[PDB]
């Protein structure tokens, strides 16, 4: 051909068929999927829909509050950074022999969100009892229409795939109880979540409301000065998010104490080191809160490390990792004709107006 | 043919266009060279000038004679229809004039427009994906109908 730059791969145009993606027994061929998606290859739409809906069916049978025992690798926000998700599994261990808990935010910001969803859903189908996925605040209609996931689905697949994802996201569990020690959630606590039963009783099968316990689980944050508070308001309006709350160190410690838990593991906030351990509880001598953030060099500019938390043999091993190369996209997945045509029009008009004076 | 029959222009318009052509033809050769266009400061930082000249130059001799000039500017008459504008836009990208936009042409023409605003590797990636999404018949190039399907609604 006359293609100028061979220093980058040319993505495959072939869309993988059901026969190529699923073995005779209905098992996803995750190695083929990984390789094809890493090449920016697409699936046939019907195949993508099958992965999403089969995953949803499994998620739908799970409880709001999962029980997950160690050993397990716990992961925070991914935000569509598919090429970093690939490194994440190398750092955390192969899902074929490693239990996983993801704390949500699979989509938005990164422009490989649908690849993240398809691959994780395929892994869920293959490893339904060892790979676990929680809901984050981005796994909803409201945020995905504001950010880029809906457009991503439109350009790569169609709104049918988007809608399937929205239903699947409604099915995502909200929390895990890990080793009967750790409450794991995307965001944090709620003034309406005082025991674990308060999570168990929720109806999660919906778009998250703008208020209430389900909202708070996905949306809340620790105070900026968590552990060094000047007042003792347990929950205050979250002026950063515009909804839900900031929770205080006394709020967390009282909850942990009451429910005989060791710590809260959550995600939802970028961390330069990929993690943050907050002040030890006065009743456990262990950090009251840990944030895990699994998206290295977030937005391609934060220059943060990512981390996962591997809990095994009574050791919590925080494993940091750095970013991996990924392909380029114009903002909002704009094609180069749509991008350049206005400039063409402006410059050609410019030229001729001046030629004709 | 009289030029008003080869364009959207009437005789009055042709005469005015003639007066501007003469002013631009510095050596009275009867043709405009690229250098003669570039003598206009306003065309200075304009990456499209080369492409427009090439499109106007229908006999491919590297210069624009008066008939080529008239027929070229005609493609921007207010009296030209939507299809003519889409055809001109397509011609911006179709460097070798074979009626298809190839991968290499799309890259080269965008590179003229973007300069160093994107690395070659970045530009190649977005060219590739534009073609994969727009190429309905799988020949790895973009036909006029494939192009229009992408940009037809932009107006």
């Amino acid at each position: 051909t006359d293609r100028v730059v061979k220093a980058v791969p040319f993505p495959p145009s072939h869309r993988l068929t059901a026969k190529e993606v699923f073995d005779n027994d209905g098992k996803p061929r995750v190695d083929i999927l990984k390789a094809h998606l890493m090449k920016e290859g697409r699936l046939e739409e019907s195949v993508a829909l099958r992965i999403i809906t089969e995953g949803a069916s499994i998620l739908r049978q799970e409880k709001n509050l999962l029980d997950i025992d160690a050993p397990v690798t716990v992961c925070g926000d991914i935000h569509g950074q598919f090429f970093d998700l690939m490194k994440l599994f190398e750092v955390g261990g192969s899902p074929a022999n490693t239990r996983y808990l993801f704390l949500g935010d699979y989509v938005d910001r990164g422009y490989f969100s649908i690849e993240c969803v398809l691959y994780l859903w395929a892994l869920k189908i293959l490893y339904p009892k060892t790979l676990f996925l929680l809901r984050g605040n981005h796994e909803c209609r409201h945020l995905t229409e504001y950010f880029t996931f809906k457009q991503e689905c439109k350009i790569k697949y169609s709104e049918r795939v988007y809608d399937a994802c929205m239903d699947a996201f409604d099915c995502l569990p909200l929390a895990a109880l890990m080793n009967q020690q750790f409450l794991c959630v995307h965001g944090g606590l709620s003034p309406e979540i005082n025991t674990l039963d308060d999570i168990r009783k929720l109806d999660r099968f919906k778009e998250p409301p703008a208020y209430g316990p389900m909202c708070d689980i996905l949306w809340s944050d620790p105070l900026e000065d968590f552990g060094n508070e000047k007042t003792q308001e347990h929950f205050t309006h979250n002026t950063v998010r515009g909804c839900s709350y900031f929770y205080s160190y006394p709020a967390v410690c009282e909850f942990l104490q009451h429910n005989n838990l060791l710590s809260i593991l959550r995600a939802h906030e970028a961390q330069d080191a990929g993690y943050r351990m907050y002040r030890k509880s006065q009743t456990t001598g262990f950090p009251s809160l840990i944030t895990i953030f699994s998206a290295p060099n977030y937005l391609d500019v934060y220059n943060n490390k990512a981390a996962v938390l591997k809990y095994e043999n009574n050791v919590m091993n925080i494993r940091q990792f750095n970013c991996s190369p990924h392909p380029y996209w114009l903002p909002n997945f704009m094609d180069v004709f749509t991008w350049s045509l206005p400039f063409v029009g402006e410059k050609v008009t410019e030229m001729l107006v001046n030629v004709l004076n | 043919y009289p030029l008003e029959m080869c364009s959207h222009f009437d005789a009055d318009e042709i005469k005015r266009l003639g007066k501007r052509f003469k002013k631009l033809d510095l050596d009275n050769s009867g043709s405009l060279s690229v250098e003669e266009f570039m003598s206009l400061p306003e065309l200075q930082q304009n990456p499209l000038v080369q492409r427009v000249i090439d499109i106007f130059d229908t006999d491919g001799n590297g210069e624009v004679d008066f008939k080529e000039f008239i027929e070229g500017v005609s493609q921007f008459s207010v009296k030209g229809d939507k299809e003519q504008k889409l055809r001109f836009a397509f011609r911006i990208y179709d460097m070798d004039k074979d009626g298809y936009i190839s991968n290499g042409e799309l890259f080269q023409v965008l590179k003229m427009m973007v300069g160093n605003n994107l690395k070659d590797t970045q530009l190649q990636q977005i060219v590739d994906k534009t073609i994969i999404n727009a190429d309905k018949d799988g020949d790895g190039r973009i036909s006029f109908e494939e192009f229009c399907a992408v940009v037809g609604g932009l107006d």
């Binding site: 950090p287 290295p296 220059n303 809990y311 919590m316 940091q320 990792f321 970013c323 | 605003n117």
Partner: peptide, 30 residues
Amino acid sequence: KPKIIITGCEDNVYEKLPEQNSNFLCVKKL
């Protein structure tokens, strides 16, 4: 009570978008 252990990594290495010259076709800022 679990033991905490941090495992480190190297710094990020990545390409930055070129500065956008407004005389040419630009990528809109995100």
